[PDB]
């Protein structure tokens, strides 16, 4: 966050007077939301998985939407999977509240990774909601009589005496109450504060319930402060986001040829193919891409444990033999290149356990 | 060499024999030597190795004796760069360890003319909870058919062999509690862990419960015979609650350790 | 399963649900009795419940036999154990206040009228073997000792704070097919005084159901849009829906549970009911 200095030199057709001000107003340039992509693979269909966060222990926020637009290149993709929250939706720093959003993706022609993705999420920070509350509900509620003689202090009060209010955000995510921190503003200090400038006696008066209000805790929960957003600007942060450089895809599938007992081995066939073609890069028989079965502590492996590919679709029995007692993953699989590149593999069978029944 | 390969043999206690899996793979060596020697004008070439005989054979004093694979290896197999093959073989099991020879005969297949051959040999040595005891005494513990499988509802019967050989009878009593036991951690790990003892004490039942064993006397043994009926489908591997307290002592011994059951 | 219909309490709970397929099987209970003879002679029991009976039982002299006899669980919605004085049938006689405060009084209340609910309806006979004609009943208000605290949770759902509901659209869907799931939360009586807040948070857990262990957080397997723990009040019938996606064939569970807050300790109830569905 930074100062910054601004200064007004300017003049009036009406009046001659150069008129001007001078203001030091400071700039939270940090972002506040955070998001983080994950990207999957599947067959012929793409998956995006945003884990959108904040980035401030002490500031939680507020989703409304995170529609993901496509690019506008070309007649491209058929997304689908934009959230549009009915009620702002929370979000905090970190614990178990990961707010996910998924896309799914499904091709016409084929894949090229060279393409972006805009995000386009649209939040609002939780004090700025929060703020608005209190700054328009419990002062100026349903009084125009009362607004047309407190306006002419506005832009103070929502610059010296609310900017500072520091809340308890675990108060109001617990019980939901809108209570300030003890160590938060002098109530002494503060209230003399407003003593040096002139002030309408009322006016004064209104604004100290107020303040004690505030620091004595009024608490409506869920029964209000959601017709309050309708007049707070949202931010907008629209953020790219692009497909990965794979050089290569493959895809493995573990068949099952013709409950399974320790020490007796299970036949199967496992059948690896490149779905390259359909991903933009044409198809390479001939790289230096082994394939090889990573036999862990709870499996073992007999017949063929690793093998250059070098056709399409490469194929060949291979049997496993557990050691565990039961409920047991396939072992996993890898294809890393030999020279410098790099490529990906859709496991079928990935998450698929197999009951292992002793004697 | 051109055939890095190891011996990873692990024992099997509950089948009680070990399993001895060798696996060879050709090696950076040939990967270097592939490029260096075979095809350098070629841009990314590939040995053409021939495994002829795949031997495992235990051995001892003049003793030489084969022994067949698990699986069935076709002999006169091929095998080319960045490869690596795998064999599995069985032997029973306590203070002798065993001797052993895996001898590997192939050859190169350098143009369909010169034909390469090796036999390269070596040998080595072999080398790497069902039935439950009682604390503070010599009690033993084990069920008959430790391993049974039915279906939902239908009732079934085990039988917990006992031996007993301390000094004087006893008159334990073994009893099902079908009551969730208290958690002592993040939510995705408190939840795993009531779902297990929820599922533990109210998947399967018993039928004889508060079960007076009458008399055990000293040297002998007794057939506590149990009856229970399953009502959530699963695989109670050792599955806990069934525990057996001693009216001498206050023992709490979880005798149930020795029990898979498995309902459908 | 249908083959398993020789035993008669699940031959009858099968029948009841079959010929009056709205309701659900956890909507039963068993009582597993265990009845001692005493006596010298083999005796054969019959115990009886509001509709069905049971077939013969040959107990021996000093055998335990267990007995389990399904019972349906009572609603709190059409009883009012809250409020139910306990009744004195000698009326008349002068009152001293038992010292009881409310949050234990109506503990007892309801374990009082949750024992006696069973007592009026539940019997039982005898014959015994050597001569069939001395026949017998039991009375077991002098046997069944006051219930507890574990027992009145399963017999009283109306004890567990919240009465939540889960259901799909189907229970079969294919791989990347889209499928929405509506959960209806309603308090009880005791979530309506038990406790001094506003609002209570929920989480949407997953089972694999064969694996049965819970699928992480951020898992590979399930996609949704929108955390998973959510807000509900303490006041209003509440309905959350959540938009599965799943990605990988198999089953899962999808259990739920309600907490006080996101303060890692603090569950409130581990709640029991859960929607299997299958995506293959």
């Not at chain 1, 082994?290 to 679709?313: D, T, V, Y």
């Not at chain 3, 009858?12 to 099987?25: D, F, G, P, T, W």
């Not at chain 3, 349906?72 to 001293?96: A, C, H, L, M, V």
Request: charged share 25%.
């Amino acid at each position: 966050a930074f100062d910054l200095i601004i200064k007004t030199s300017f003049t009036k057709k009406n009046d001659q007077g150069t008129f001007g001000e001078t203001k030091k107003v400071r700039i939270q340039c940090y972002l506040q939301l955070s998001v983080s992509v994950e990207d999957i693979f599947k067959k012929d269909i793409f998956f995006f998985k945003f884990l959108l966060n904040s980035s401030v222990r002490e500031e939680p926020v507020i989703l409304y939407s995170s529609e993901l637009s496509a690019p506008d290149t070309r007649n491209d993709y058929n997304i689908r999977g934009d959230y549009i929250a009915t009620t702002p939706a929370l979000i905090t720093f970190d614990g178990n509240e990961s707010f996910i959003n998924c896309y799914e993706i499904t091709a016409n022609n084929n894949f090229d990774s060279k393409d972006i993705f805009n995000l386009k999420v649209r939040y609002n920070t939780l004090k700025e909601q929060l703020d608005c509350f209190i700054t328009d509900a419990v002062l100026i509620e349903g009084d125009v009589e009362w607004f047309i003689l407190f306006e002419k202090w506005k832009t103070f009060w929502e610059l010296e005496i609310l900017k500072k209010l520091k809340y308890d955000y675990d108060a109001f995510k617990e019980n939901r109450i809108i209570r300030l921190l003890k160590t938060s503003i002098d109530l002494n200090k503060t209230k003399s504060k407003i003593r040096n400038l002139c002030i309408e006696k009322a006016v004064l008066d209104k604004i100290l319930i107020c303040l004690n209000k505030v620091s004595r805790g009024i608490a409506v929960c869920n029964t209000d402060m959601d017709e309050y957003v309708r007049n707070l600007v949202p931010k907008q942060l629209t953020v790219p986001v692009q497909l990965p450089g794979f050089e290569q895809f493959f895809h493995v599938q573990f068949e099952q040829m013709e409950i399974a007992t320790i020490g007796n081995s299970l036949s199967y066939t496992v059948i690896v193919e490149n779905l390259s073609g359909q991903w933009g890069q044409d198809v390479i028989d001939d790289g230096g891409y082994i394939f090889e079965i990573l036999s862990s502590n709870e499996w073992l492996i007999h017949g063929q444990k690793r093998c250059a590919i070098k056709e399409k679709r490469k194929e060949f029995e291979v049997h496993l033999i557990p050691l565990k007692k039961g409920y047991l993953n396939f072992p996993r699989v890898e294809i890393t290149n030999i020279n410098g590149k790099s490529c990906r593999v859709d496991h079928s069978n990935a998450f698929e356990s197999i009951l292992i029944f002793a004697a | 060499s051109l055939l890095n390969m190891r011996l990873r043999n692990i024992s099997l206690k509950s089948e009680h024999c070990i399993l001895s899996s060798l696996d060879f793979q050709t090696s950076k060596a040939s990967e270097q030597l592939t490029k260096k020697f075979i095809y350098p004008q070629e841009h990314n070439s590939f040995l053409k190795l021939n495994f002829q005989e795949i031997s495992y054979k235990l051995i001892d004093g003049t003793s030489q004796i084969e022994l067949d694979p698990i699986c069935p290896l076709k002999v006169p197999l091929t095998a080319f760069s960045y490869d690596s093959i795998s064999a599995t073989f069985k032997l029973v099991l306590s203070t002798q360890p065993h001797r052993v020879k895996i001898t590997l005969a192939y050859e190169l297949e350098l143009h369909p003319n010169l034909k390469l051959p090796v036999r390269t040999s070596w040998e080595t040595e072999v080398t790497l909870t069902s039935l439950v005891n009682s604390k503070l005494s010599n009690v033993k513990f084990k069920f008959i058919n430790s391993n049974i499988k039915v279906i939902k509802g239908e009732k079934f019967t085990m039988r917990l062999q006992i031996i007993n050989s301390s000094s004087s009878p006893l008159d334990l009593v073994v009893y099902y509690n079908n009551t969730i036991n208290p958690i002592p951690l993040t939510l995705e790990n408190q939840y795993q862990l009531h779902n297990k003892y929820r599922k533990i004490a109210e998947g399967i039942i018993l039928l004889s419960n508060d079960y007076k064993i009458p008399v055990v006397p000293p040297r002998e043994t007794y057939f506590a015979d149990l009856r229970f009926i399953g009502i959530m489908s699963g695989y109670y591997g050792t599955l806990s609650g069934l525990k057996v307290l001693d009216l001498n002592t206050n023992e709490l011994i979880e005798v149930g350790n020795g029990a898979s059951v498995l309902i459908q | 399963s249908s083959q398993v219909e020789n035993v008669d309490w699940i031959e009858y709970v099968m029948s009841k649900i079959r010929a009056e397929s709205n309701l659900h099987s956890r909507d039963f209970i068993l009582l597993l009795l265990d009845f001692r003879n005493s006596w010298i002679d083999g005796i054969k029991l019959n115990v009886q419940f509001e509709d069905f009976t049971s077939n013969e039982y040959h107990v021996e002299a000093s055998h335990t036999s267990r007995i389990i006899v399904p019972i349906k669980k009572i609603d709190y919605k059409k009883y009012n154990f809250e409020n139910t004085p306990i009744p004195r049938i000698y009326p008349g006689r002068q009152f001293i206040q038992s010292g009881l405060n409310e949050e234990q009084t109506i503990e007892m209340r309801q374990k009082f009228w949750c024992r006696e609910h069973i007592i009026s309806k539940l019997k039982c006979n005898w014959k015994l073997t050597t001569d069939q004609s001395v026949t017998g009943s039991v009375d077991f208000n002098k046997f069944i000792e006051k219930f507890d605290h574990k027992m009145v949770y399963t017999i009283y759902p109306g004890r567990l704070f919240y009465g939540v509901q889960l259901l799909l659209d189907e229970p079969k869907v294919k791989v990347g097919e889209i499928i929405n799931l509506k959960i209806i939360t309603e308090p009880t009586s005791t979530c309506r005084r038990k406790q001094n807040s506003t609002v209570n948070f929920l989480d949407i857990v997953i089972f694999d159901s064969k694996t049965s262990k819970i699928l992480p957080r951020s898992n590979r397997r399930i996609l949704y849009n929108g955390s998973l723990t959510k807000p509900i009040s303490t006041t209003k019938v509440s309905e959350i829906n959540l938009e599965i996606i799943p990605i990988e064939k198999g089953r899962y569970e999808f259990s739920v549970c309600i907490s006080k807050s996101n303060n890692q300790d603090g569950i409130i109830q581990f709640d029991s009911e859960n929607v299997i569905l299958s995506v293959i």
